[PDB]
Design a protein around this ligand. Structure first.
Ligand SMILES: *[C@@H]1O[C@H](CO)[C@@H](O[C@@H]2O[C@H](CO)[C@@H](O)[C@H](O)[C@H]2NC(C)=O)[C@H](O)[C@H]1NC(C)=O
Ligand SMILES: *[C@@H]1O[C@H](CO)[C@@H](O[C@@H]2O[C@H](CO)[C@@H](O)[C@H](O)[C@H]2NC(C)=O)[C@H](O)[C@H]1NC(C)=O
Ligand SMILES: *[C@@H]1O[C@H](CO)[C@@H](O[C@@H]2O[C@H](CO)[C@@H](O)[C@H](O)[C@H]2NC(C)=O)[C@H](O)[C@H]1NC(C)=O
Ligand SMILES: *[C@@H]1O[C@H](CO)[C@@H](O[C@@H]2O[C@H](CO)[C@@H](O)[C@H](O)[C@H]2NC(C)=O)[C@H](O)[C@H]1NC(C)=O
Ligand SMILES: *[C@@H]1O[C@H](CO)[C@@H](O[C@@H]2O[C@H](CO)[C@@H](O)[C@H](O)[C@H]2NC(C)=O)[C@H](O)[C@H]1NC(C)=O
Ligand SMILES: *[C@@H]1O[C@H](CO)[C@@H](O[C@@H]2O[C@H](CO)[C@@H](O)[C@H](O)[C@H]2NC(C)=O)[C@H](O)[C@H]1NC(C)=O
Ligand code: NAG
Ligand code: NAG
Ligand code: NAG
Lengths: 324, 172, 324, 172, 324, 172
């Protein structure tokens, strides 16, 4: 029996397993897990920029100025917006908000507003502007959405109410207005004096109008009346004209779009923690170099790609075969 | 496996070979020991690196869900949006899982091929100067010292050099 | 010449063919067809539960109570709904049905209603309720949708008509109402006495109103007038208020959602047969263990996955090679 | 095929071998006959079973069309819905058909590999105690009775046992 | 040393490269590029049929008959429609066009109209029909959309305006109408005499109405008023009835659909050249036998399949290996 | 490569072989020259043609974008439409690019297999009537004139015919 040389391959203590088309549960010498499965369970700043935490406020509650949302009257630039599934503080005086989901979608490309006092309340010299409701009470007295103006009768008269604003602000501006639909004729008379009224809004492109509807409805927050809100994005250098014989809920402000970019509304019951991330999910932040994750499909930031997989492991080494 | 070497005619792996995927165990008068084949290991390492990058790279403009909301009077549109976003999710999960299976298969066979090719390279160089034992080993018909073993391992084995001595020993 | 041993492989009489990337029409020793191509040509019960067969009625014809649809006045739980492409019996008095496709989509998650008499007709003590039309004639006399009430003048007067219902039924309830748009002033006066009327509907969330439109239109089923129907899903414990000075077509009933689950409307001209299936298509029922089918993309039940393929055959055996 | 055995150096298949995919035909003084190789057949059978299940399983959360209707004023939305549902249909039909082609290819090559590996296993065990005829057959240099044939077929052929007799017969 | 035979493979001068999963930049003896990357930079006839070149006109400008679009008053069959991103000539009298994008989508299946004079202007014997605006001026005098009729007061009266048309044309017919929303009461009185007017339109299936809105708006093309246009596809053998007490902008014409088929609106600033193609993109025409292209995703005609790829090259030959 | 022939034991290709992908170079007393193997080249040519057609054909009902427009109050619907059309674009770009990579891989290995199988076919026919040099060449133990070379090249080499002469020359 002479000198010998033998050809062979590496084995080790690895218990790493992979699947193939032909065979499942194969032990290999080396493998690469390419799926991130972990997150930190926290809502964080995104690249150092905090989200806008609405708390118990809805998007409508914020922009109208529900008095329960006063912390939000001036807010800095945000990276995403946190909204609860069913926020308590929205339309405190009950009603509706036309094209509300379109407005929320707009917010996915906006990172900051500058609130501009476009129609200062003191200029309504022919109408009462202090009107409020117990539905919006503050410290036990009637009040109202902070950003809006409830025009009512003055000296027992309501002349045609006309206001206009030319957007010279340098960017497109979000403007909201409403029409009050009273419960009954007493309400209409005591508030407006006039009957058969309308609210007209007109820009270069929009012409929307309303005749207020008097009708008995179930009480919501104490009120059978409703306020129906609408909105528009007023282009640079365009003018908006409001004209009404009664029932106008006028904006005092507009929200100039002051920063644009990728953002979004995250649905969460949680609160911001003192943490930093490049990738935020509703369940928590991800910090990984891996190319895939299975944490949640709705992520904001510089994220890995989401898959439903429970495992994604690539073989790199060879079949790990028991020694002889 | 596909090429019949790994867990095949070479029945088991070597815990003692720690510096590469494939290589040699030699036995002579001077002693015995393991050594990785640098060239074939490096070649495989580069292929595998390229493979993992390629699989990752092909799923880089993969679909992303984008949060949108819908009214109680927009249920068809909501459902369309959901079926779309879920539909793409399922397609990309499929692309990822299938790709990883198909390529894992081929990776294991690639290593098998690399072992087989290394064995055959050595075999085709040594020719009848050795006996093929059938277990991955060759038994020499001439004494093969450490320098001789090194020439086999770097692909510069000199058949003509040992041809005369081997054939006499094979026949005697 | 000595003893011999030979290595070889199986061949047989198989004519089964498969394709590969590299070669087409390859005969193999064994193969697995994974595509179901057959169905029974019948509409069947789905897991023992029959579909709702509308016959010549549309969804609107059923829910309004078109008199041609009286077999449908009380129906048990269904597994799917069969509707013809162009059902004859829908709006017998012509008109429109707002958000009709949204209503049909709702039905894809509903498997039963309980029809509840929410606004009993006898309680309209200040209005006439026997009003009908030749467009809805039964046995040669004017009649009307069975589930609805046409309020008209009584004693030559039409006072404000007010009805309300609080949904105490234990589930969300579908409620339909309409507004009559007359052809002419004669019609309006003889039916309602009043002019410049409206129909108002209000819940906690919905405030929809109408001013009836008098206008000449082509006759449909004999009538130039129209009835415009709308609907809502009234939440548990919410109230609906109807208020009208004329032209209200009031519901007498609501449809409480009494069973929920995966369902759907199948478009078919066919009729239910005495057969059972786990998987129904519009062409017929499928009974298979195979993972794919190519019968029709719109299936209801526990079905295989649909593909457009004409064939899906997996090789399992080897290339079948002619003997030597 | 890829491995050169099926419809290759083994030119045809055996109608007479009915109890497996691969195996043997032996010829000696005692007689002749076919026999399947149990081990390699079973190994292939399990691989193939796993393959069919894997292909089926990867298309289990495949897209489903959901019936919706649209008004005459919702033609864009109708078209979007149609393009979506048809788009997914086309993607999944592609996934299914492509997968079946690619895997059919590999299935036929898998069987080819299995035959080649079986041949080589036998070859590497028998060594020079036989002649390789080039048609899948080996001709023995020593008489190989039924028990001898069984040892070849179960992988326990004893080369050293017949080494002496074979080499004398090869040379005489 | 004896006679020899050697086995080998082809090499050549090829520098063609391909990629694989395992290796990038591999030189092969033969390869097939399957991706078309080139186009001719021109807008062309499609199979010998020219597109409709709108020039500075929008779809609305064409169909209403903006006087700046008079070249388009009669147009032959087209293969596609070229429209600029922001055409100058649309609603010359400012306003809106309801369901405008739905109308544009309809055009993707229409290849020709026959314009039919359904409501000849001379039959409005009780109203003035010569009304025009400086916003639509021609040769320095007021004018109006060529296809529409502005009904105004005659002899200081505006009686109920009624017109009707039964579609006997043999195909479905596109019909457009409008309502004028004045700036002020002076306008309303001088034009219509009546106040509290309406425009009603009715077919067998459509019942749409309007009350004109008087309101101050920013001037567009000199005008604070607006015209709100709507449209319908009138079925074969159906009738349309117009009825108005003021503010009706009536069609004089309908557009009978005279050819149907695959078409589309291409967005382009370019002009038609004297060239022929089977495949048109917005960047230029493609002429290729290759199965894929990367030119632009929005193509019209018999085209290859679009992919985002920069390269798609299939190896056909073998690895090209340097000689020894 | 996977089969170890191309850029493997056959170290380089032949610029001088211009009429096919694989073949022979022979050397005898009458002269030397290249010749393509018609049968194996044709077989590969047909496989490759089928492959290119199959890859193209599987992406024939591939997604098409359809131009639609949306109002300033239909931004969600616009975004849905965009995400859909772009989503399908990304899926089909993936299908195309992945398919071309995976199949390019297999194409190069297919040629490698074809060379290996051709070599082995010749080897298994020539048997010990030749020496295997280890570089793709066989050296004959009997003179092999042009007609002899042609029989090797068309697969009708007669081993028994030269068996006697070769074994005497191998041994002397
Ligand atoms: C609204 O304000 C603008 C800015 O003061 C008015 O004037 C011009 O509008 C253009 C629009 O392109 C601006 O870019 C210019 O800055 C202005 N040009 C000048 C020097 O007058 C515009 O006229 C105002 N609108 C109305 C209705 O008066
Ligand atoms: C292949 O291996 C052989 C054997 O070891 C190498 O030859 C030796 O090279 C080293 C370094 O120069 C020294 O030990 C001697 O010069 C050689 N051996 C002796 C003692 O003669 C050879 O260099 C290697 N060749 C290649 C191509 O890598
Ligand atoms: C409508 O009916 C309900 C049930 O009778 C009324 O009363 C409560 O409503 C709550 C809502 O969450 C129900 O869950 C309870 O069963 C009721 N609580 C009790 C004990 O009163 C409700 O008030 C009615 N609506 C109106 C407007 O009166
Ligand atoms: C492999 O095959 C050999 C040859 O048949 C087997 O040896 C025989 O085993 C059977 C069952 O015990 C009996 O006929 C004899 O005991 C053996 N042969 C004779 C007559 O000596 C052997 O068992 C097999 N080995 C393995 C590992 O399966
Ligand atoms: C509108 O015109 C048609 C055609 O003149 C009128 O008459 C019939 O309508 C049917 C509809 O299916 C057509 O197919 C026939 O050509 C007509 N039949 C005959 C012989 O009268 C239709 O009546 C008209 N509409 C109105 C309201 O009068
Ligand atoms: C394989 O090649 C051999 C050798 O060339 C062929 O035999 C010759 O055939 C040609 C054409 O008929 C003639 O040159 C002679 O008849 C043969 N050679 C001589 C000189 O004897 C043979 O035809 C080929 N066989 C097959 C199956 O193709
Ligand atoms: C995987 O294989 C190991 C042994 O290698 C075994 O312990 C385990 O049961 C297997 N797991 C699965 C998923 O079957
Ligand atoms: C498939 O092959 C068989 C012979 O095996 C032949 O009869 C038939 O023509 C082929 N069919 C097709 C699809 O070409
Ligand atoms: C591709 O390879 C060639 C040499 O074959 C080399 O010149 C070139 O740099 C390579 N290109 C890339 C993309 O790296």
């Amino acid at each position: 029996p002479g000198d010998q040389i033998c050809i062979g391959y590496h084995a080790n203590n690895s218990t790493e397993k992979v699947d193939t088309i032909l065979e499942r549960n194969v032990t290999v010498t080396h493998a690469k897990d390419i799926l991130e499965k972990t997150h930190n369970g926290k809502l964080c700043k995104l690249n150092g920029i905090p989200p806008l935490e609405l708390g118990d406020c809805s998007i409508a509650g914020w922009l109208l100025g529900n008095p329960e949302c006063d912390r939000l009257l001036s807010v800095p630039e945000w990276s995403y917006i946190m909204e609860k599934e069913n926020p308590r503080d929205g339309l405190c005086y009950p009603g509706s908000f036309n094209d509300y989901e379109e407005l929320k979608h707009l917010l996915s490309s906006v990172k900051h507003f500058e609130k501009v006092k476009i129609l200062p309340k003191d200029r309504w010299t022919q109408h009462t502007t202090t009107g409020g409701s117990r539905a919006c009470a503050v410290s036990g007295n009637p009040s109202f959405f902070r950003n809006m103006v409830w025009l009512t009768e003055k000296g027992s008269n309501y002349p045609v109410a006309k206001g206009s604003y030319n957007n010279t602000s340098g960017e497109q501006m979000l403007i909201i207005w409403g029409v009050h639909h009273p419960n009954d004729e007493t309400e209409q008379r005591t508030l407006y004096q006039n009957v058969g009224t309308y609210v007209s809004v007109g820009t270069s492109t929009l012409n929307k109008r309303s005749t207020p509807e008097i009708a008995t409805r179930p009480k919501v927050n104490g009120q059978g009346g409703r306020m129906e809100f609408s909105w528009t994005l007023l282009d640079m250098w365009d003018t908006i004209n409001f004209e009404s014989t009664g029932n106008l809920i006028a904006p005092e402000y507009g929200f100039k779009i002051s920063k644009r970019g990728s953002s979004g509304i995250m649905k969460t019951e949680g609160t911001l923690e003192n943490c930093e991330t490049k990738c935020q999910t509703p369940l928590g932040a991800i910090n990984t170099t891996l190319p895939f994750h299975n944490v949640h499909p709705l992520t904001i930031g510089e994220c890995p790609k989401y898959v439903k997989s429970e495992k994604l492991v690539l073989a790199t080494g060879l079949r790990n075969v028991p020694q002889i | 496996g596909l090429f019949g070497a790994i867990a095949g005619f070479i029945e088991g792996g070597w815990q003692g070979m720690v510096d590469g995927w494939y290589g040699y165990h030699h036995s002579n008068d001077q002693g015995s020991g393991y050594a990785a084949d640098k060239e074939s290991t490096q070649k495989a390492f580069d292929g595998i690196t390229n493979k993992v990058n390629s699989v990752i790279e092909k799923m880089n403009t993969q679909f992303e869900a984008v949060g949108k909301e819908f009214s109680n009077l927009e249920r068809r549109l909501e459902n369309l949006n959901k079926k779309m976003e879920d539909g793409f999710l399922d397609v990309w999960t499929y692309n990822a899982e299938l790709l990883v299976l198909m390529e894992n298969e081929r990776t294991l066979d690639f290593h098998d091929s690399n072992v087989k090719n290394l064995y055959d390279k050595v075999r085709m160089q040594l020719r009848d100067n050795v006996k093929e034992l059938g277990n991955g080993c060759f038994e020499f018909y001439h004494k093969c010292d450490d320098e001789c073993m090194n020439s086999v391992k770097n692909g510069t084995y000199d058949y003509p050099k040992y041809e005369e001595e081997s054939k006499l020993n094979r026949n005697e």
